[PDB]
Structure 1
Amino acid sequence: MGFLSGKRILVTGVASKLSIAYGIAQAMHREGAELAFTYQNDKLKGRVEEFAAQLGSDIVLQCDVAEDASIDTMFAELGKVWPKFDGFVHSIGFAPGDQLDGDYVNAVTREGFKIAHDISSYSFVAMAKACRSMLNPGSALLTLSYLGAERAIPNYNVMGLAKASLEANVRYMANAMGPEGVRVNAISAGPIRTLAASGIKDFRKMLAHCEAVTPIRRTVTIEDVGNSAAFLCSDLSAGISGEVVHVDGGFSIAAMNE
Structure 2
Amino acid sequence: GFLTGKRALIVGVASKLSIASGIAAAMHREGAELAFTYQNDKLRGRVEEFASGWGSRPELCFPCDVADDSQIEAVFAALGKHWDGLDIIVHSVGFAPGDQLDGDFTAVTTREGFRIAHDISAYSFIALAKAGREMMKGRNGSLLTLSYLGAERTMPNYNVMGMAKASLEAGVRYLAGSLGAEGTRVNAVSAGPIKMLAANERQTPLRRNVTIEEVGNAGAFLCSDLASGISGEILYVDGGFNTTAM
- TM-score of the pair, normalised by structure 2: 0.97
CA apart distance, 1:83:
2.9
State the Cα distance separating 1:255 from its structure 2 match: 1.6
Counterpart in 2 of 1:99?
Answer: 100
The answer for the alignment partner of 1:89 in structure 2 is 90
| Pair 1:122-2:123 in alignment | yes
Superposition map of 1:35-114 within 5 A = 35-58=34-57, 59-114=60-115
The alignment status of 1:134 with 2:135, answered yes or no, reads yes
Matches within 5 A, 1:219-238: 219-238=209-228
1:64-94 CA distance string (max 9 Å, x none): 0001011011111111112311011000010
1:24 — aligned with what? 23
Output the CA distance in 2 between the equivalents of 1:220 and 1:146. Answer: 13
> Equivalent residue of 2:4, what SS?
coil
What's the offset of the Cα at 1:56? 1.8
Give 3-state SS (helix, strand or coil) of 2:142's partner: strand
CA-to-partner distance for each residue in 1:76-131, whole Å, 9 max, x for gaps? 11111123110110000100011001110001010000000000000000111111
Equivalent in the alignment of 1:185: 187
The answer to whether the 8 Å contact 2:85/2:139 transfers is: no
Tell me how far apart the structure 2 counterparts of residues 243 and 120 of structure 1 sit (CA, whole Å): 18
Post-superposition shift, 1:138? Answer: 1.9
Q: RMSD value over aligned CA atoms?
A: 0.7
Give the deviation of 1:207 after TM superposition.
Answer: 1.1
Cα separation, 2, equivalents of 1:206 and 1:184:
33
The answer to whether residue 145 in structure 2 is matched with residue 155 in structure 1 is no
Structure 1 gap ranges (5+): 193-204
4+ residue runs over 4 A deviation:
none
Give the match's secondary structure for 1:233: coil
* Residues 134-178 of structure 1 deviation map (CA, whole Å, 9 limit, x = unaligned): 104320100000000000111000000000000000000001001
**How far apart, CA to CA, are the structure 2 residues paired with 1:107 and 1:240?**
39
Task: Please state whether the residue corresponding to 1:80 is helix, strand or coil.
Answer: coil
Per the normalisation by structure 1, the TM-score is: 0.93
State the 1:241 CA deviation: 0.3
Name the SS for the 2:189 alignment partner: strand
Q: How many residues align?
A: 243
| Residues 241-256 of structure 1: pairs in structure 2 closer than 5 A | 241-256=231-246
Letter in 2 for 1:100: L
Percent identity for Structure 1 against Structure 2 = 70
